[PDB]
Amino acid sequence: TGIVETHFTFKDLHFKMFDVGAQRSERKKWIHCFEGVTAIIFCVALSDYDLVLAEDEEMNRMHASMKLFDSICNNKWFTDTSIILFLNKKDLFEEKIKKSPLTICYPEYAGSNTYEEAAAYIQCQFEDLNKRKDTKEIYTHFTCSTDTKNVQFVFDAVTDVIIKNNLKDCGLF
Amino acid sequence: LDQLRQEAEQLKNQIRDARKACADATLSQITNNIDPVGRIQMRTRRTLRGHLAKIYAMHWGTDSRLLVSASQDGKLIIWDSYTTNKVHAIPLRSSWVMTCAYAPSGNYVACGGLDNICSIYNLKTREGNVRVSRELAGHTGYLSCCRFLDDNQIVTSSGDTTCALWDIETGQQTTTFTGHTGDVMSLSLAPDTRLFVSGACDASAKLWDVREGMCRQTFTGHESDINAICFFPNGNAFATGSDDATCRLFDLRADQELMTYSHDNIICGITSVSFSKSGRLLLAGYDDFNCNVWDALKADRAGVLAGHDNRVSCLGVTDDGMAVATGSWDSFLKIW
Amino acid sequence: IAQARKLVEQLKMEANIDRIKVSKAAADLMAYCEAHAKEDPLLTPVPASENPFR
Amino acid sequence: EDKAAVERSKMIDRNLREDGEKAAREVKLLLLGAGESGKNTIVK
């Protein structure tokens, strides 16, 4: 159906969560309509890295996620909006890292058998371009899906982006 | 099969070659002579205030003396030029609305948005305001445009590349057509309810009949998506609104391309195209605040006007050329 | 197969009418668009005397 | 009857003015990601 809006006033602020709505149409047509948003949420699964359901035999889900992230960051409409890094891997990724050598993410792997170095590598590799980093801050959080949906981190991020936009247009930075 | 596609596309090449051969004389005739035009063609009317949102599209499809526009804050706008005020301000359930329409009788107002819901509002009511709007669905793609010539049949588009014809009384999917590769962006109401036009990539100005239903008119040559389309005041003509800033007149009977006024003076695309009267003044929006109006008959720019500090999105012209309505995201509505 | 046949069928029948759709199109091109091309361009310039706006 | 139109023009502006900062104060977000990328995993 259409886009689903979830309005919840938790953390003393009227949060509104807007989904993609499964448009399955031209990207820009619904990208430019959402202009004026304060912050966006970027969700990528980490424990399902072995899944190759994105393409039959051409690419994997990692390539699609990286391409979509690059398109979002390089887009001229959202060059100033901050971005949020979320995931849904609390312990499944850690359990899978025991058997998976973490070599599919990068062919030139130079890490151990754990996943801390893999997380560091992916989080430092996400920001391929640094021009938008100065204009818009990038927030990254790991071990998501807490009790109250990680209310503390999202509240801190939203208040930080709000104050940043407030001081940007008043000639204070 | 492969053989069927091959024979079909040799047939298409033969057909387009024949059309070019037959229309070369017409192209030479139209390009040989031009008519004189004015210098500015401008007369200011007023300024509109009382808005704090963005706008996408409007619809000047009524013989009365009012204007209608839609905003993303959730409220519709029905303004008068002289009064610079609104008769009523009804709210909109949808968060975003991109479709705006009005009735010649001033009784029904059509709006819709990303929720795949086409809502018809009651402009005239006993209480003076509409209590609620009826819900219509049946699509998997985002709503793009909707038009109607009466209170019996309504045409609408979707992001799933299909044109839906519905009836107010029935309230169900009455007519549905198979779609092309690209998504339909806009539809133009026919002067006498003959056919409606859909525009997308590789399907520039594809005409579909309302009664018979089959496709007869299809043109190719505009790779970029076409944003806005409108019928000529004289009738039996098309409009080109490709995102590649390509502006070229088209004919229904000719089924062939015409002269193009592309130039290096601009580097961005266009968002809307509109005729003043029989192509006397081509009005087209651009990605910048600055705007220009061309003269198709004179093959030159009629004038330059911006009236905004941000990219303009909506543009409408009265059928009799009484007034033109335009607007950008700066919540400014100016009649040029 | 079946889907491609419908696309071929639509293109096959469209060319049939389009082949005979000329019907001396140039006569219409130079006879249709001048009917209303002289009213509005002269009507729009008003010296703030009969214009309904302002 | 022109006075009534002006009076009506005053109350529509006030009605639209109230909805201005009321909707602006409400923060809007944007959720976008890969297909089935834990849409229901996060508490909503």
Add this chain to the structure above:
Amino acid sequence: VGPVTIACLGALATLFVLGVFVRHNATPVVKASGRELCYILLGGVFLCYCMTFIFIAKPSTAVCTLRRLGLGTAFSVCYSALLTKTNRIARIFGGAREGAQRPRFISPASQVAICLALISGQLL
């Protein structure tokens, strides 16, 4: 001799500060002041430093008139410049938590309007 030399030293110091800030408006610390109320405060300080010349002068109808309103205006300018910056910073940092929207009357020009209104109250 004492007052005039100390006034000259203060005027030179504030002129040097003005030249530094007007030419080094790239580091965010000087931008965090506001870059309008800072100039207003510098003008007030310059008026305070140069008012002693009016103070030590031959009495006259013009001299007496100037030294009557200046004694309040010079300090009111600085006080308003200090007040508006703190007020805008506090309002911006307070209204972010509740009602996420642009605070009213905050701008490089609007704050100047408020500061000049506060000064004009004392002038009136």
